[model samples]
Structures are given as C-alpha cells and as structure tokens.
Target: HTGFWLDAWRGLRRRPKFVIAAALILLILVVAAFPSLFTAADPTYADPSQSMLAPSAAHWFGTDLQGHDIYSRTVYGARASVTVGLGATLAVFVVGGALGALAGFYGSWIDAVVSRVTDVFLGLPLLLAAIVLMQVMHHRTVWTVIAILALFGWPQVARIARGAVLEVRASDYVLAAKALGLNRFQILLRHALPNAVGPVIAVATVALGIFIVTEATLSYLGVGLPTSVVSWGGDINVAQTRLRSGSPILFYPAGALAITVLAFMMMGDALRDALDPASRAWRA
Candidate 1:
C-alpha cells in the first residue's frame, strides 16, 4: 500500500502539470492562511473618500467602492473561499464515502436504499438547490454554505465511492478475505476501502474547486456569507456595479478566484492521471 502511494508520488513529481498545479495550490494556501503576510491594508476598513482609487505603489490592486483596498480584500477573500472548499469537500467525503462504502460492501437492500437516495440528491441541481435553500435562511455564514454544499454535493461522491467499492469488492483479495472468514466490515474497512479511495480522492479534489465556485456564486447572488465577511464572490458582486466605470477592481478578486479554481482543477487532473493505474501503464 505504501509502495503504491510512493509510486504515485514519484509519478506526480514527473508531471510538469502536477508540479505547476501543486505550486499554485501551495501559494493559494499560503495566501489563505496568512493574508497579513501579503498585505498590510485593512480589508474591512472603509474610507468613502478613498473609494475607487486606481492601482499605484500605495495600493497594488487599487481600492473598491467602500475604499477598502482591493488587494487586501482579495487576499482575505481566499480564507473564506478556501475554507468553504475544504470544508465542503471533507463533509461530502465523509458522508458520501461512508454511505457508498457500506452500500457497496453490503449489497441488496442497503445498496438499493443508498442508490435511490443518491439518485434523488443527484437529480437536484447543486446551484439551484443551494440558491433556493439559501434564500430561506436568514443568517447565512461560511459554515452554513459549506453544509448546504455538502448536502447537495454528497450524491456525486456517493456514486463514485459506490462504483469504486463495487469494483474492488470483486477483486481476488476481497474474495480471499471473504474465504478466510474475515468479517465483511473488516474486509471493507481494512482492504476494500483502502484500495478504492484513490478515485474518490481525485474526485474530491475536483469537487473542491466546484464547491468554491458554488460558494462564490451564492455570495454573488447575495445569499451567501454576510457583507462583513470578505469573499471573492462578494467582491465580484460589488465590482459588477462598477463595471461601467471601467475600473479593474472586479478583475482582482475575479482573477484570483479564476486562478485558484484553475489550480485545483489542474491538480485534480494531474492526480487522476497519477493515481489511475490504467493511465500509469500508458504513461510508462
């Protein structure tokens, strides 16, 4: 098992795409973790007198309508976006992964129930469902957004995990474990899931980007985090009105969001190629 991961790491290291994507992701993580290291300006402080200042030595990204430094706001925005992305991905992984694993390991009634439930959730469009659900909640926060995303997001993960587990369940090792009288749960936890989690992880990486986009979309629509919270989505929404002025304030956060999403997507693609055994053969 360790050798498999070591090989995957070696394969990842050989891919330029993975290297670039990983670098970008690391930078984003640093930006998200310590926004203060990148900028000294206050993101929340507003000086209407200084509003809409152009980019200069004093303010690299200029200022927004509220006189908040765009650079600072953009830097701070990463915290919420990354938080929601990571949080929702983890939540879905646990919820969806567990359900799918159980269903796949114990077929028949459990499979039928989980499959139908997954289908129902999958039928609901994530954005639309989130939009509708968010409207009813009065106090929308980052955690709430993550919860909603995970609620709708789990079905996809469930389906992937289910398929992977099913494939692993039919393998010789699983059958041997069964013949050896190891309990079904033990076989599933110790053997099946470990072999089956690679695809789920790859999918989760991609899904993190999607969840970030979704959170931004929700905030852009005025249904996500409150105005007090600095988020790329909220900044983009503010920039929409200033578009006619030809100021590039909107581009700062929007560009950051784009780059972050692209990095995650690229990382996901590289991971999938590295982790998928079939792809490894061709690359070798």
Candidate 2:
C-alpha cells in the first residue's frame, strides 16, 4: 500500500515530461509568490508618457496602451490566475469529493440522487453560467470567481470520485474492514478515500489549468477581476485594440497564460501516467 504511492513518485521522477512540467510549475509558482524577485517596477503604476513603448532595457516586455509596465503586469498576473486556479481546485475537491464519497459509500438512494444531480450540473454550460452570475454581482473578487468556477467544476470531480470510490469500496480490503465492525464512515475515510484519490488528484491538476484559462476568458469578456487588479486576462483585454497594429504586447501576457496552462496540463498528463497502473504496465 505504501509502495503504491512511493512507486508513483519514483515513476514520476523518471519521466522527462514530469521533470519539465514540475520545473515550469515551480517557476510559475515562485513568480506568483514573489513578483518582486522578478521585477522591481510596480505593476499598477501608469505613466502616460511611457505608453506603447517598445521592448527595451528599461522595460523588458515594454509598456501597454495605459503605460503600465507589461513585464511587471505579466509577472504580477500570475498571483491572481494561480490563486483562482488553486482556490477553485481546492473548493471542488472538498465539495465534490465529499458528495461522491458519501454517495458511493452509502450506495442506495444517495447514489441515485447524487448521480442525477451530478448529471444536471455536468450539463450546465460553465461559461454562460459564469457570465450571467458575474453580471448579477456588483463586485467580482478572486473568491467570487473561485466560487463560480467551483460551482460548475465539481460535477467532473464528483463523477471521478464516485467511480474511484465505488471501485475502492468493492475491494477485498474494504469488505474485510466492513466485516471487522468498522463503521461506514471509518471504512469510507480509512479504506476507500485514500486509495480513490489518485485519479481525482490528476483531474484536479488539469482542472486547475482550465480554471486559470476560464478566469482569463472572463476578464477578456469584461466580467472577471476588476481593471484595478493586475491579471493576464485583464491585460490581454487591454491589448485587444493593439491587435491591428501587430504589436507583441498582446502576445506577452497571452504567451504567459498559454505557457502556464500548458505546464499544468503537462503535469496532469504526467501524473495520470505515473499513477495509473494500467498505463504503467502499458509503458513497460
């Protein structure tokens, strides 16, 4: 049992994809945590005279239309995007994991009810729902976006958790735990959840990337974090008018967004391959 996770860790370490993705993610996290380490310029500072300056020694990524330092903004943008991604992923993991675990472990009317509800949420259009919800709210903060994303995101996690828990609960160990007088809760928390968490973790990793992109999309649509907050999406929104001029300013934040999302996706893929025994055997 202990060997299972250890083996996965070893396997992940051996994969070049995992190594690269881990490095990229680590770099991005550091940038998010300490933007000052990357740049001294204040991201929010705007000087009209510096507007639209091309890349130079002074401003590596140059200045945007509003004269904000593009480099600084891009560096600081990581915090908001990463925060939403991590926050939303945590929210969904708790909500979805609990519901799915309860439903799968009980395996009666609870299963039917949770499954149906999951299906309904699965069918809801996330982007449209978020847009509508954002419009109704007067203030759009990081927590608000996280809540909205978790609302639509949980179904996928629930389905994954339910399926994983169902399999884990049916195993001989779980059956033995049941026979040994362990309560339903004990069997669930001790026997089922730990074993069932791998797939959920992998899915959450990828989902984090999606959440970041979704935040960017919302900001682009003018409903994400307010203009006062520095974010890649908001910066990208401001860069739209420069599209006709073939400016690279738009590409700076857009590229950062693309790279961050790609790193997360790659990490998720590597994690899935490392954690799934079937994939490991296939590779062998």
Candidate 3:
C-alpha cells in the first residue's frame, strides 16, 4: 500500500527547487563516490615543479604550495566532508530521536528530564569542548570529529524531534491507536514517529552543511583531519598565508565548500516546502 513516504515523494517531485537541488546533491554523491570519473591524478601526489602554478589545461584547479593537484584534492575532499556530516547527523538522529520520542510520547518526568538535558547541552560550551575533544579522543581523525560534532549537535535535533512528536501525539491516528489498546511504545514507534520523522530528517539535512563547515574550520585551525586526509579546510589552511598569489588556492576549495553547503541548504528548503501540508495545497 502507498504510505507517507509516497505522499512525500509526490510532493517533492512537484517542487522545482527541490528537484534541482536533489540533482545537484546526486551529482555531488557521484563525484564523492567516484573521484576518478572526474580526474585521474592522485590527490596527494605532489610535484615540486608544479608548486604554485596557475590553473592550466593540465592542472585545472592549479597546485598548492606542496604541489598537490588542487582539482584532485578538491574532488577527493568531498568524500571526507560529506561523510562527517552524514555520520554526525545519523548519530544525532539516533540518540536524539530515541530521547525525543520517549519524552514527547510520555509527556511526564521523562519529558522534563530529557528537556533539561537538552538545555544543558544547548547552553554548554560546545565550541571549547570540541577543541579539547580532538586530543582527548582517539585522534584528529574523521570519526573523532564526527563524534564530537554529534555530541554537540544532538540537542537541536532532539528539541525538534520532541516538538514534532508532541504535535503528532494529539492527532487522530495516535489517539485511535491508544484507544485500540496499542501500547504507548507501539503507537509511537509504528504511527507517531513515521509522521514526525520527516521534519527531523529535513533539519538534519540542513545541519549537514554546517557539519562540513565545522570540519573545515577545525582543519583550518589545525585540529581537524591529519595530513593523511584530503580536506578543503586543510587546503585553505595551507594556502591562507599565500594570498600574494592569485586567490585560486583559497578560491577553489572555498568555492567547493560554498557550493556543497548551498546545495544541502537548498535541498533542506525544498524538503521543508514539500513536507509542509500548507505548501501542498498550493498545487491543488
């Protein structure tokens, strides 16, 4: 039988911005998944003679101070950046979704405790904590950064999930499920959450861009991915002092970051428009 997802699909397909953004994101996925399709050069392979050379027919995005191919590094960097965002978002959703669902569905001390916990995290010195966590954790690896971001990020997602669940809790289906003697957990897991999950996912999609930016910032600050990883932030950090040269070094990676962030943000806007029932009426 058709389901809420089907309705979402129907709604999403009608939004041109959403469609275009979705296509852009898909292309990004393709590049990240298969960097070789776009370029054959090694991301880390550096030739001293090519160092600081301007973009040419041979070196499209040009070379860094270390002579690494800017084009290849930029393409490969997508994999790490996108992965961190996705990984952090998923982690936030799991922890936040569980806490939020229980808090919203039950609506008692559970809600109070969860809400307070969310407040604590919301008000905490998350930025300072993130910097410290880089060394405290395993290492300045991709996963470590993701976990740190997830830790700081979940509160927002939790509040959103909680609010969504609470709104749906009063709906007819949930009440009907309760009337039919379905347990609270069953009603929430099987019915209420399905309807509520959409907004949470949309928020997460938007947040992914922020995560990518944060990863870049950390790398730029020297506490992000180690030299082993190809990252936009790492590229920017290396080239930031060399502004005497043309802006291509900073521009290339920065432009990629901008495009990637904008794409997700547009996708988020599309999702919000599609998932919103009021927007659906415009078409009818």
Candidate 4:
C-alpha cells in the first residue's frame, strides 16, 4: 500500500490553504458517499397516508408531491452524482492520458494525427455533442452518459498531459533514463508519467464536478436518463412542475449540487498545492 497518511499529514502541516480546501471536501465526500447511514427512510417509498408533507420527525426533509421523502432521496442521490462524476473522470484519464503521452513522446506524424483528433473533439460544443451522442445511444444509462462525457472529457486531459509530458521529456532525468539502456516505455513509465500525472490528476479532480453538473443539465433538458432511475438530475426534472408550488425538491437538490461542486473544486485545488508547491500559493 502507498503510505497515504505519511505525506498526507505532512501536507496538512506544510500548507494551511490546501488543508482548508481538503478538509471541506472530505466532509462533503463523506456525507454524500454515506447518506444512507446518516438518514432514515426509503428514498423511493411513497407515504400515501401523509403525502406532500413538510419537515417533521416522522418525515424529515419534508415530502415530495408523490409522498416520497426528500431526505431519503438525497441520501441515495449521492451515489448517482459521485459515481457519474468519478466514473467519467477515470474514463477520460485513461483514454486521454495514454494517447497524449504517446503523441507527445513520439511527435511528428503521430502527434499530428492525435492532435487533429483532439481538436475535432474540442471543436464540438460539450452539451450539444453529449445530446447527440445520448440520442444516438437511444437512452442514456449511467455508463452511456459517462461514456459520452468521457469522449469529450479526454481531449482536455490529453492536452494537459501532452504539455506536461513534453516538458518532462526534456529534463536531465529523462535523458539519464534514456542513456541508462532503458527503452522508450521504461523511460515513459518510470519518469515521464509520474511528472505528467500531477497536473492530469489535478485536472481530473476538478472535472468531476463538471461531469456531475452536465449529467444534471442533460437530465433537466429531458434527454438524460430513463424515469426508472431517480438521480439528483432526474429529481430536478421531476420537480420542475412543483418548483414554485411549495415543493422543497428543487431547493434541496440544487443546494446539494452546489455543495458537491464546491467540494470537488476545492479538493482539486488542494491536490494541486500538494503536488506542486511552486505552482501553489500555500507555503505554510
């Protein structure tokens, strides 16, 4: 195992700015990931006897028009938001990082082709492109949405990775590795990839928030997922009719979305600070 807590704790002492950001994110992540143990009631169950009720001990967080508990829905909603965001981020890193590393390391014709393809993807508007892909997929499963987001996601990751890899490729360490009888892959894996991963990891962390928002945006537009699934995105869409009509559905889910976004963004900043102290303003 990696000595996660060794440098992790040292990082806290070394960088207070990063610590603040990281601590806030850790709080949010824990709440979202484990909403079940924190809240009681079934997210999907309908209380026909007490429908559309406001907050109370018997039914905290109020009730939806369908008598569903907003509290419970939120508890479960965390899984959807976190899963899609992290999943999409992972997807982009793999596809994008590999191609970018190869293109940067090889350059010439390989770089040209890869760069062109990345450009083509970047040229397409994210939402429009996703909508088109979603439509093509017929209906968006969780994975389908992640796949679409990843398709667009990789370009940005690739661009960052290529820049980092190119910079690292010129370093003396890289030249030394090359001269030590190490092959291209060995140099790349041993040296180039580690340096490149820093920025890529930072980008990926921030990008998760975007993907979560995009999933919600697509769902709100009525083209994201099947009704069978009740993600926060779906929750918003279903609550539109009751938004101003005394339903807390809109308020709660929107607040959750905002908090989630803030958490991930701050976490990304903390990660960047930890990875490269020179690139960060935190030095205490």
Candidate 5:
C-alpha cells in the first residue's frame, strides 16, 4: 500500500501542472493544520489605525477597517475551511458509500431501502436543505457543518457507487468469489468495493472543492461557524457591511477562498486524468 501510494504520487508529479497543484495543496494543508505557526497576528483583533489599507509590507494583503491583518485572518481561516471539507467528505463516503455498496452488491431489500433514501435526498433541494439544517441546528460547530453537508451530500456518492456496483456485480470475478463461498461481507468489501471505489474517488476529488465552497458560503452568510470561529467565511461576513472600510479584510478572505477553490479544481482535473485512463487523452 505504501509503495502503491508512492508510485501514484510520483506518477502524478510527472506532470508539471500537477506539481504546482500539489504545492498549493500542501501549503493549504499546512496552514489549515497549523494556522498560528504560520503567522503571529490575532486574526480577530481590530485596529483603527490601519483600516482599509491596500497591500503593503506591514500588512501584506493590507489592513481591514478593524485593523486586523487580512493575510493573517485568511491564514487562520484555513483551519475551518479544511476541517469542514474533510469532515463532510468522510461522513458522506462512510454513510453513502457503504449503503450504496450494500445495495449494489446484494440487490434485495437493502437495495430498496438505500435506493429510496438516495431518491429522497436526490429530490430534495441541496441549498435549501443546507439552509434549513443551519437554521434548525443547535450549534454551528465544525461537526454541525459536517453533518449537514454529509447528509445532503451523500446522495451523489450513493448514485455513483450504485452505478459502479451495477457493473461490478455482474462481472465474472464476483461470480467466482461467490462460488468460492465468499460471504456477502467478504465479497462486497474485498472484491466489489475495490472495483466500485473508482467512481467514488473521481467524485471525491471534485467534492473537496464543493465542500470548501459550501462552508465558505455558509460562513459568509452568518450560519456557518460561530462569530468567534474566524474562518474564511466569517472573515467575509465580518467585512461585508464594512467592506468599503474593510476592503483588505473582506476582499482578501474572499480572494483566498476563490483561489483555493480554483486550485482544487485544477488539482481535480489532474486526479481525474491520473486515475482514469480514459481521461488521458484530455490531459495534454
């Protein structure tokens, strides 16, 4: 497994664009995991002296209306942005991917139950569901965002897993596994799942970008993290009404989110190519 991952990394790095994308991803992760270590300023503390300043040496991206450092806030906000995306992605994969795998592998009552659930979520409006979840939820902790996003997000993975399973279930390998007395759990996990995981993976690469965007949107609107959390969205929300006076703070946060999402999108394209041979033609 170590060798496999290493090889995959090496293969991905063979493309110069992917190398740049990897660097961006790494930098983001580093900041997300250790925001304080990267910068010293209090992201939330306000200062009247440096409000609305443009990019400069003292403030880099510039100072906000409140005197907080825009660059510092964006750097600190990395923790929230990465957390929501990762937490939500894991929740969806576990809940949706497992149920979908069972449905496709067994093709009975399990399938019926899972399919109906998938349909229910699929039919529901995504943005509306997220909004309602935010309104009704108790606290807007990281977990709350993860739960809301995962619950709404699972249908997509389920659909893809189901489709992939349909193809995997009919293959001769599955029949052979069955003939060998492989139980349902073993069959699904050892054989069917490995094959079906492809589509889920492809979708996951794209989902990271989506999850980050969603979190930022929610935070920007006031229902995401608490006011004290200081995420990318929170920064934007803070600077929104005061943007004319807090251009550096608000604009910088928004710009970071945009750049991060764009980087993810570009990385996703690289992953799609690396993982899917069919997409090789589209790469170069």
Candidate 6:
C-alpha cells in the first residue's frame, strides 16, 4: 500500500499519457537498437540516380543530397543519438551522483568545496560551454560529443543529488545506521545512497532529452560529429540549407528528432512524478 515503485506503477497506470509517451520511446529504442528492422538499405550507400526522390515504398524517406537513403539514414541516426544521450546521462549520473553523495555524507570542508565547484560549473551555460569545448577539441566525434555533454551537464544533476542526499542525511534510518557502528562508507552505500539516489535518477532521466538536443545542436553548429557520420543533426543541418528548394527533406529527420526528444521528456516527467510523490499531490 505504501511502497515506492508500487505506487509509481499505480500512478503510471492512472496516467495514460505516460503509457503513450513510453510506447513512442520504446519505438525509438527499437529503431536505435536494431536499425536493420526498419530498413536493410545501407544508410551510407549513395546512388546518384536516386538522389532527392520523393517518398516511395522503395525509399520511404526519399534520398538526401548525396543520394543516401533518407529512411535508412534516419533510422541509423537513432543509434548515434540514443547512444550519446545514454552515454552522457550515465556519465553524469556516475560523476555527479558520486561527488554529490560524498559532499552530503561528509559535511564541513568537503561539502563546501563540492558545493562551490558545483555552483561554479552550474553558472556556466550548458550549451555555450559545450559549444566552446567542442570547438576546442582536437577530435570531434560521437564519443567526444558525449564527453562534452557530460562535462557541461553534470552540475545540474550534482546539485539535484546533493539536495536529495541532504534531505535524507538526517533521517532516522541514517542516524540508526551511524549508531550501529557502520562505517561512513558503509552507511552511505547501504543507507544514505539508496534512499537518496531516486531524485538524482529522476533528474538524470529528465535531462536525457537535453543531452540529445545538445548533441544535435553541436552537430548543427558543425562542431559535433563529422559529416561522414549519419546523425539526425547532420540530416537536419543539411536539410535546413535546402529548405526553400526542398522543404520536404527537413520534415522527416526533424520530425524524428522532435518525437524522440519529446518522448524522453514525457517519460522523464512521468518518472519524476512517479519516483517522488512530493512532486505531486497524490494521496498515499
């Protein structure tokens, strides 16, 4: 009756929007994980004859300027976008959560130092920082893009984790754990961390879309993945230039990007409400 995940599942069930959003995200995941399911056409293979053809059963998303299969490219782009988003999020979760938990668990100088560092990093605009960093990187690729996003994005998650940990740091169980001769690390790992990680995870989930968009923006700005890589950002960038001449090319890739980002954001909102009841007015 009063369980966390149980109540969260109940909440999700009551909200069909969450289900719809999650289903769309699941579709994206399938495409990302298995692009071959959507199309067997080689995304990079170009046929000059097939260039810029309109939607047909043979080439659903048509062909790009380079004659690459738009349908194949769009589907393949999912793998890159999703991987960067996930890789960046996981990096933030690990780095931010660990640093935040340490600061929360060990107050005094440690907390002050971490809090100041977080604030300093937080003051930097995420996109701006990423753009600058990307510009400076010797090698710009998918992996570097993920690293840049994680670097700029971690502060927000760190602040979230820190706040959550602080809220639970003085709880009865934490006190009991400390009183039972459990070492500092033991208490933090077993008691403090478990209770405090929920909000951090929720924040990270919500931030996934932001990372994906950031990756796209970098690519759009020409500081992201090389043109050799078939990413949604590259597609949109290429299409945006030819908008007046071929507006249709912009629609497919942009639509895919929009849908994927929106899906993650929706799932994040749902998960936030689910994991943290305090965020909502739902009765237990």
Best by lDDT: 1
Per-candidate local distance difference test:
0.85, 0.84, 0.81, 0.78, 0.78, 0.82
lDDT score at residue 138, model 5, on the 0-100 scale: 72
Candidate 6 C-alpha lDDT tens digits along 43-93: 887788866788788887777787987888888788899999999999989
Better of 1 and 5 by TM-score: 1
Worst 10-residue stretch by lDDT in candidate 2? Answer: 275-284
**Model 3: residues with Cα > 4 Å off, grouped in runs:** 135-138, 244-247, 277-284
Model 4, range 1-284, lDDT digits (tens) per residue? Answer: 45544656675566766667667767767876777678766777776877678888876678887789787787567777777788888888888889999999878999999999999988998899888877767655778878778888788889878877888887798887777799888878977876777778887787887888888788778788667676777788778887677655688878887777887777777776676556445322
Model 2, span 58-121: residue lDDT tens? 9887888878878888877888899889999899888888998888878989999999999988
For model 6, give the 10-residue run with minimal summed lDDT: 275-284
lDDT of 5 by residue, 1-284 (tens): 56544778778878977888889989888888887787777877888886667887777887766788778877767777887888888778787778777788788788899888888878877667898778987766878788788878888888777877887888898888889798878888888766667667867767878988887887777878888777777776656676675334556677778988887888878777776656355422
lDDT for 41 (candidate 5): 76
In candidate 6, list every pair of residues with a backbone clash: none
Candidate 6 runs further than 4 Å off: 1-3, 279-284
Rank by TM-score, descending? Answer: 1, 2, 6, 3, 5, 4
- As for model 4, its CA RMSD to the true structure in angstroms is 3.7
Per-prediction TM-score: 0.94, 0.94, 0.91, 0.87, 0.88, 0.91
Candidate 4: which pairs clash? none
lDDT of 3 by residue, 64-116 (tens): 88798788989888888888888987888788888888899899799999999
The segments of candidate 2 whose C-alpha lies over 4 angstroms from its true place after superposition are: 277-284
Better of 3 and 5 by lDDT: 3
For candidate 2, list the clashing residue pairs, or say none.
none
Task: List runs of model 1 lying over 4 Å from the truth.
Answer: 277-284
